[PDB]
Design a protein around this ligand. Structure first.
Ligand SMILES: [Zn+2]
Ligand SMILES: [Zn+2]
Ligand SMILES: [Zn+2]
Length: 77
């Protein structure tokens, strides 16, 4: 419902591509799904793509994961 979809929360499946902003990630485990990455400032930053082995989740919206621009435009309040 609306509460479960207010933030991204995408859970990755094996074979999907994750994105991390190397400039803004607090640590290497901070990741974004493709849509949030492409809808965020980090599309313009130094980034790393990493194919998921399944599991993990998108960190769009977590101030404690990103030094700047924690929300993509879609999820930004
Ligand atoms: Zn996302
Ligand atoms: Zn997002
Ligand atoms: Zn960034």
């Amino acid at each position: 419902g609306p509460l479960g979809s207010q933030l991204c929360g995408r859970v990755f499946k094996s074979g999907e591509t994750t994105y991390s902003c190397r400039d803004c990630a607090i640590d290497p485990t901070c990741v974004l799904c493709m849509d949030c990455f492409q809808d965020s400032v980090h599309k313009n930053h130094r980034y790393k793509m990493h194919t998921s082995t399944g599991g993990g989740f998108c960190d769009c919206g977590d101030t404690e994961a990103w030094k700047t621009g924690p929300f993509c435009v879609n999820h930004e309040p």
